[PDB]
Amino acid sequence: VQRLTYRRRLSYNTASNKTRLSRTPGNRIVYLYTKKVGKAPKSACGVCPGRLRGVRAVRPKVLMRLSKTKKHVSRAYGGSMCAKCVRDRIKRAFLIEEQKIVVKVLKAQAQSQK
C-alpha cells in the first residue's frame, strides 16, 4: 500500500533506469538500482550460437575486477572458442596439411615418372 518514489532525477523509465525494490532494515520499502546484465562472450563468427561456458558474464569494466581464472578456460583458444571449434580446427588443420603433403609427394612422383 506504500507507494514508492525515485531517488535520482531520472523521471523516465529508460534502459539505464532499470531497477528493483527491496526492504530496508528500518521497515520501509525502498527503490534500489539494478545494474544492467552483462552477457557472456559467444561464438566466433560461424558456428552454432551459444554463450561460452566458464566465463563470469559481467560488464567489461567489471572484467578489470575479474582475475585470470574466471575470464577464460585453461585450454588454448579458451575464451574465444566453445571447444567444438577447437576440436574442429585441430582436425581440419591436421587433415588439410596431411593432404597437402600427399598432393606434394604425388606431384613429386609425377615429376619423377614424367
Binding site: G46, V47, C48, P49
Partner: protein
C-alpha cells in the same frame, strides 16, 4: 476440421483487396511461410530471413536464395547454363 475452403492463409486479411489479388498472394505466402529441405544437413529447417536470405536452424549455414522460394526456376536455368558453359570446350 477444414474451417476455410478457398482463402487458406489469406483469411487473416478478410474481405479486402480483391479476389484475384488474394489468389495471387496466396501461393507466394505459402511459399514464403513453408519450411524447405536444407541441402546440407538434410533437415527441414530453412526459415526465411529478410528478402532473398534463407537460414537453416541446424549447422547455421545461411544461404542466399530466391525472394519467395528456395530456388528460382530461372536461377536453376542460369546454373545449368553456367555449368554447360564451364564444361563446354574448356572455357
Amino acid at each position: 476440421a477444414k474451417r476455410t475452403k478457398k482463402v487458406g492463409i489469406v483469411g487473416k486479411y478478410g474481405t479486402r483487396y480483391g479476389a484475384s489479388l488474394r489468389k495471387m498472394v496466396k501461393k507466394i505466402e505459402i511459399s514464403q511461410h513453408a519450411k524447405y529441405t536444407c541441402s546440407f544437413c538434410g533437415k527441414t529447417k530453412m526459415k526465411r530471413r529478410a528478402v532473398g536470405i534463407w537460414h537453416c536452424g541446424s549447422c547455421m549455414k545461411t544461404v542466399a536464395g530466391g525472394a519467395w522460394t528456395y530456388n528460382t526456376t530461372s536461377a536453376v536455368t542460369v546454373k545449368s547454363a553456367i555449368r554447360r558453359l564451364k564444361e563446354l570446350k574448356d572455357q
